[PDB]
Amino acid sequence: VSPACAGRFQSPVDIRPQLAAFSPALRPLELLGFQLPPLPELRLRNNGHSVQLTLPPGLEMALGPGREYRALQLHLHWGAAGRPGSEHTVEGHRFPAEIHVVHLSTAFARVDEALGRPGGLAVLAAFLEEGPEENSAYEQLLSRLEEIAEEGSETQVPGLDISALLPSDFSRYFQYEGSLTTPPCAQGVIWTVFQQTVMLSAKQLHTLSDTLWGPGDSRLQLNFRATQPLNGRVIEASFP
Amino acid sequence: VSPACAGRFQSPVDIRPQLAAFSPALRPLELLGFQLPPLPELRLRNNGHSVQLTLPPGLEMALGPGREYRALQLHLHWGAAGRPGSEHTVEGHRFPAEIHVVHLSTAFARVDEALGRPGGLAVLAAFLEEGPEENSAYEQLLSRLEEIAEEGSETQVPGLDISALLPSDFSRYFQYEGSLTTPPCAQGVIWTVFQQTVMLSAKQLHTLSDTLWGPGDSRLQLNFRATQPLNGRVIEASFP
Ligand SMILES: COC(=O)c1ccc(SCCc2ccccc2)c(S(N)(=O)=O)c1
Ligand SMILES: COC(=O)c1ccc(SCCc2ccccc2)c(S(N)(=O)=O)c1
Ligand SMILES: [Zn+2]
Ligand SMILES: [Zn+2]
């Protein structure tokens, strides 16, 4: 029963853009090394809570000058047939799905030293919505979900352009301080939520929500935490 | 002799208010437990680089919701007769002196763990200027310098209200991330520089700069580092 999961400053949150603070010090995010060669392959796992892709060393992310991170992994949150499952909401709207790319501050060698430390971990988050076309970067992961239908299963996938899983607009985002959304829910996590969304086909969103199985003989669906109150935190925005 | 002194994100810096970014998310500083009783006494020490007062446990400081610190020590930077010695400057203007109250994040149990980690240490900085009245708060410290004029000397002083050494409006400050201004010049220090100043008499300012002796047979004077480039860092302001 991680006591951190009862902290005052938890994630995810409902983003109310009218209450967000415009902060012009929030510059465009910068990503280096995200365009991977096909080999070595990466490991894609059904962990019973999400599908998680382990990322290789060398993916560097900066929130700004002096604010440097390395990417660890990415995973997804999703709903069910006719039910949205983003973690974050905007003005109470929940989107079909959400991607999280979790990073470690370059000041720490291990996750366990960064847990609960200010700015020790940073998450990049983007909503997934339905578009008309099959998203080619997503297809490389989604086309392998059948291989990992079973809880605790994994498979290897070719490296891909990891930045193609995210929006092209890196300028416009909300940022706030919060927590991991799974035990141990440690605080001090810098959350960056893109304004622009990513487009998947209806078929892709259905593959995501209908393929994977979780604890027991239950479908892995609706794997989002309820929104947590801001409790006086102010969400910042990189635009007015 | 410490290559970190040549890092990219060093302190101090020149503040250019018109180029600061206003972020309404920067709330008034909260400083609790700073009104110390006369007992126990505190160590005041000439360390040959500054005069330093050791602070007891219980001085709690927050830069924002869930971003808490405990004060460790305070020290000063000053010039010489008719020469200002602040560390920060404002549009190129050097103030007569500067006070620094150094704090440790509650997320770290030791200073050595915090050095080089983002937001591990936070310093509150205020400019000291010349005014016509004698300053009662500062007198408690200045009146005791004669006793510690020898490099390496120390004395015990009565408890004092540390918060009385600071400016009037805790809602009005600049903020950026930089470094210690002495070796090891570690990065990831959050600097908060009050917009308003504190006034000492000309006599008090003279007492500060003229009583203490440093390494060799030289005066302890002009104990400030040269200003360092922002290198892309944007200074934030808590007010438009
Ligand atoms: C239902 O969602 C998940 O399965 C999930 C898994 C991991 C993580 S991050 C953990 C980083 C970590 C922590 C401890 C040890 C080693 C790695 C998150 S999140 N949304 O970013 O908080 C969700
Ligand atoms: C010439 O100036 C100084 O004497 C001076 C001394 C200490 C400090 S902070 C040290 C924090 C610390 C470091 C290591 C171990 C334990 C405490 C600073 S400053 N201006 O805050 O960078 C100036
Ligand atoms: Zn997540
Ligand atoms: Zn100092």
Numbering used by the authors:
A (entry chain B), B (entry chain A): 19 to 258
Please, what does the article write about this entry?
Figure shows the interactions between CAII with compounds 4c and 4d, CAIX with 4d, and CAXIII with compounds 4c and 4d. Meanwhile, a hydrogen bond is formed in the active site of CAIX and CAXIII through a water molecule with Gln70 and Asn65 or Ser64 and Asn69, respectively. Asn62 in CAII, Asn65 in CAIX, and Asn69 in CAXIII differ only by the numbering but correspond to the same position. On the other hand, a comparison of the structures shows that compound 4d is more similarly located in the active sites of CAII and CAXIII, while in CAIX, it is shifted toward the hydrophilic side, which, as mentioned, is not fully visible in the X-ray structure. Notably, the electron density of the 17 amino acids at the N-terminus of both X-ray crystal structures of CAIX is not defined as expected. These amino acids fold in their 3D structure to form the active site of the protein. The corresponding heavy atom RMSDs for 4d and 5b are 2.18 and 0.92 Å, respectively, and despite the RMSD for 4d being above 2 Å, the binding mode is captured by the docking reasonably well, especially since the receptor used for docking was originally bound to a ligand from a chemically different series.
